């Protein structure tokens, strides 16, 4: 989908903000809190307010991917205000972190924790960096990581996001998003 991506210097309040002027306004014949963006293949970002949109080098921005986000964009936001996320950024290429997501907000509970490092989830708060009890899971993007794939070792490759459940030392994938 084509919107407008001519950048105009408004002065508001005593302050310059470059703004899309016509694609704000084009914007929205498809959402209520959409904004286009400035910054090749273009991308999103949801913000705790609305979603901004960099369109692509043809001035175009994949529609039913934003659908995505404009239908879901509470649990979203839930998602970056839990995982102490300012704002979160998709690509086309990025359904498979929209999908965890999605997963993640249906299925964490309050006995859920999060590594105090990053986007990781796991189903238990009796978990560190060298402990993590049988059955429990982990939610999260990267794996095998260390020198020699020592740190969260999986039973077979995993690349990407990912649910998997710890036995026996290692990490065993359960769903691949
Ligand atoms: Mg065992």
Same mark, same amino acid.
């Given at each position: 989908?084509?919107?407008?991506?001519?950048?105009?210097?408004? @002065?508001? &309040?005593?302050?310059?903000?470059?703004?899309?002027?016509? *694609? &704000?306004?084009?914007?929205?014949?498809?959402?209520?809190?959409?904004?286009? *963006?400035?910054?090749?293949?273009?991308?999103?970002?949801?913000?705790?307010?609305? /979603?901004?949109? +960099?369109?692509?080098?043809?001035?175009?921005?994949?529609?039913?991917?934003? &659908?995505?986000?404009?239908? &879901?964009?509470?649990?979203?936001?839930?998602?970056?205000?839990?995982?102490?996320?300012?704002?979160?950024?998709?690509?086309?290429?990025?359904? $498979?972190?929209?999908?965890? /997501?999605?997963?993640?907000?249906?299925? /964490?509970? %309050?006995?859920?924790?999060?590594?105090?490092?990053?986007? $990781? +989830?796991? $189903?238990?708060?009796?978990?560190?960096?060298?402990? @993590?009890?049988?059955? $429990?899971?982990?939610?999260?993007?990267?794996?095998?990581? *260390?020198?020699?794939?020592?740190?969260?070792?999986?039973? %077979?490759?995993?690349?990407?996001?990912?649910?998997?459940?710890?036995?026996?030392?290692?990490?065993?994938? /359960? @769903? @691949?998003?």
């Amino acid at each position: 989908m084509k919107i407008d991506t001519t950048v105009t210097e408004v @002065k508001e &309040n005593g302050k310059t903000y470059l703004r899309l002027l016509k *694609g &704000n306004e084009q914007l929205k014949a498809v959402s209520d809190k959409a904004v286009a *963006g400035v910054n090749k293949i273009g991308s999103f970002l949801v913000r705790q307010d609305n /979603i901004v949109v +960099f369109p692509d080098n043809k001035g175009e921005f994949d529609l039913d991917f934003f &659908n995505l986000l404009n239908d &879901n964009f509470e649990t979203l936001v839930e998602y970056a205000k839990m995982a102490d996320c300012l704002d979160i950024a998709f690509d086309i290429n990025e359904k $498979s972190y929209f999908n965890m /997501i999605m997963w993640l907000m249906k299925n /964490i509970d %309050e006995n859920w924790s999060q590594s105090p490092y990053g986007e $990781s +989830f796991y $189903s238990s708060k009796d978990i560190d960096w060298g402990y @993590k009890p049988e059955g $429990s899971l982990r939610v999260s993007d990267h794996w095998n990581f *260390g020198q020699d794939g020592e740190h969260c070792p999986t039973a %077979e490759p995993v690349d990407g996001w990912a649910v998997c459940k710890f036995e026996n030392g290692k990490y065993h994938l /359960i @769903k @691949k998003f």
